[PDB]
């Protein structure tokens, strides 16, 4: 697409993937971003559109790994130019993902994450006929100490482990180093890596590994009753507690009761909440940032503004 075509192509609820990259840079492996977003678990109307923003010289030499997926588009451009991000309706997306291929070509601890930090600040600082600070962004960081530059309403100290920092606790920063402990976790229990792969990849099983190993591309096939039976598995979802079936209990009520009724009536198995950073404070606040609570105890208190992490069946 060119910027005019994108501006007239009304995009909403989509995913924008900002890629810093170059003709000679190392290949990111974008199939793995697209496949979980293209599981048969979603109805075709439910699939989020994906827009890559970046160098076409980079994207060309990856396209053949993902050209068999629906609702994908490319804008030749830069994540640092306001015009591109306005053309792809950055204020209406469900997620903006910021990635860099240029992680290994220079090593100075500063020079590794410059572009991603500038891009996140560029998006945050925009104005729309709202300011951009409310846009959902996730940034990959090469060096986890640089996390301190992503937020300015937080407390920074380089001795702090990444998992304690605000943008990580909110799920707006991610770094490959948090997978280091997956080695140890997998040694002590081989089932963990199995569960995480099926939960995260879209559910790929050894038959898919074999088919891709033989053919290196995802081969399409005609549908059958067994082909359709494989769609009947759970997908992960976030539910707003202000919705009709649960606002009756998101009023100061009980997480255990919410779990029990959602499980019996819909098989929902909600496994955590996403809680506004200031919602425990007595004063109002303009901060829309949320942080993650995993497996709250039965007696835990439900504020009406909370979001519920849950697993929900196919239909």
């Amino acid at each position: 697409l060119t910027r005019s075509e994108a501006a007239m192509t009304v995009l909403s609820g989509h995913v924008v993937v900002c890629i810093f990259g170059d003709v000679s840079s190392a290949l990111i492996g974008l199939r793995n971003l697209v496949m979980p977003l293209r599981a048969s678990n979603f109805h075709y109307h439910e699939l989020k559109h994906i827009v890559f923003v970046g160098s076409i010289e980079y994207l060309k030499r990856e396209w053949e790994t993902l050209h068999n997926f629906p609702k994908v588009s490319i804008l030749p451009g830069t994540p640092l130019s306001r015009a591109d991000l306005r053309a792809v309706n950055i204020n209406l997306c469900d997620m903006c993902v910021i990635l860099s291929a240029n992680q290994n070509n220079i090593d100075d601890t500063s020079l590794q994450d410059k572009e991603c930090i500038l891009a996140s600040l560029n998006i945050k600082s925009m104005q729309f006929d709202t300011t951009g600070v409310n846009i959902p962004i996730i940034t990959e960081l090469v060096n986890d100490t640089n996390v301190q530059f992503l937020d300015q309403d937080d407390d920074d100290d380089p001795d702090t482990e990444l998992y304690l920092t605000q943008p990580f606790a909110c799920g707006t920063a991610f770094a490959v180093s948090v997978l280091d402990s997956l080695m140890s976790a997998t040694y002590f229990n081989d089932n963990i890596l199995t569960l995480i792969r099926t939960l995260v990849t879209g559910g790929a099983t050894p038959e898919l590994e074999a088919l891709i190993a033989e053919e290196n591309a995802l081969r399409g096939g005609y549908s059958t009753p067994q082909t359709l039976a494989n769609r009947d598995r759970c997908r992960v979802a976030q539910l707003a507690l202000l919705d009709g079936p649960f606002a009756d209990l998101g009023d100061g009520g009980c997480y255990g009761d919410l779990f029990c009724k959602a499980l019996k009536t819909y098989n929902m198995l909600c496994f955590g909440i996403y809680r506004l950073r200031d919602a425990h404070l007595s004063t109002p606040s303009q901060c829309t940032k949320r942080y993650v609570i995993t497996n709250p105890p039965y007696e835990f208190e439900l504020v009406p503004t909370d979001l519920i992490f849950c697993l929900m069946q196919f239909d």
Partner: protein, 280 residues
């Protein structure tokens, strides 16, 4: 040595002031060789601390929360100007992330990168944060010299702090050094000047109290027309030998259409975008 020497000899200039400031450098690489000699020459008001401005403990070590301002110097001779500017913006966000209220002055190598600097939520030029873009100012001084040759050297002499060197011979250097002796200064206009037109106060200040006035704060106006008159509380821009000479600009009473021709603002001429083959 090549970046700080021209700065130090102007900051610590003989004619500057009775009160000293600065005294704090920090850099990740130690001051080897001749640079340390330059520090020795100024030891009573210059101190170097090894450290990196990306580390908040080093910002604490040099007491950033107490500093009047922070100055960021650029590698003018680097192989990748956008890398340098991104690096210096990283330094700016490090400093502002550590402390909202410190004033920052920074060198920028390329013009477009200045936009990035405006994204930082705790940066505001209304409070004196600003960026000196070297490409912008270099090519601008050259451009104005295409309109009036010599103007680049005039403007460059109006910033650097210089005394009046006296010359006894009749050579061109005598008259030149006389002209070099002054700088651009500013002061609030005395109430005696309020309510009457700008050319008249230029004439008054030049004739009666020997100050050349170029511009006034009607946000910032160079040489405004005879229809415009002085408001109370206005600031004037003066060319003068020394700052103390300008204070009599204040201490004074009666002492003795279908087509697009322009950019969207009307500030610059404009035309439709030509293919390069049309202009070669």
């Amino acid at each position: 040595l090549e970046s700080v020497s021209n700065f130090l000899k102007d900051f610590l200039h003989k004619d500057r002031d009775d009160v000293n400031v600065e005294i704090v450098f920090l850099h990740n690489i130690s001051p080897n060789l001749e640079l340390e000699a330059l520090f020795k020459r100024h030891f009573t008001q210059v101190e170097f601390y090894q450290g990196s401005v990306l580390n908040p403990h080093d910002l604490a070590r040099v007491k950033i929360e107490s500093a009047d301002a922070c100055l960021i110097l650029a590698n003018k001779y680097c192989a990748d100007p956008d890398a340098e500017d991104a690096s210096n913006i990283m330094r700016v966000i490090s400093i502002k992330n550590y402390h909202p209220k410190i004033r920052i002055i920074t060198q920028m190598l390329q013009y477009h990168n200045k936009a990035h600097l405006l994204n930082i939520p705790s940066w505001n030029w209304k409070e004196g944060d600003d960026a000196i873009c070297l490409a912008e100012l270099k090519l601008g001084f050259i451009a104005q010299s295409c309109l009036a040759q010599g103007l680049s050297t005039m403007l460059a002499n109006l910033f650097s702090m210089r005394s009046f060197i006296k010359i006894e011979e009749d050579t061109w250097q005598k008259y030149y050094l006389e002209g070099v002796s002054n700088e651009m200064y500013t002061e609030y206009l005395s109430s005696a000047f309020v309510g009457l037109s700008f050319p008249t106060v230029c004439e008054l200040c030049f004739v009666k109290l020997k100050l050349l006035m170029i511009a006034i704060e009607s946000r910032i106006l160079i040489n405004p027309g005879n229809h415009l008159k002085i408001q109370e509380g206005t600031l004037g821009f003066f060319i003068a030998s020394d700052a103390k000479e300008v204070k009599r600009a204040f201490f004074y009473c009666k002492a003795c259409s279908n087509v697009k021709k322009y950019d969207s603002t009307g500030m610059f001429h404009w035309c439709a975008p030509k293919e390069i083959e049309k202009v070669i």
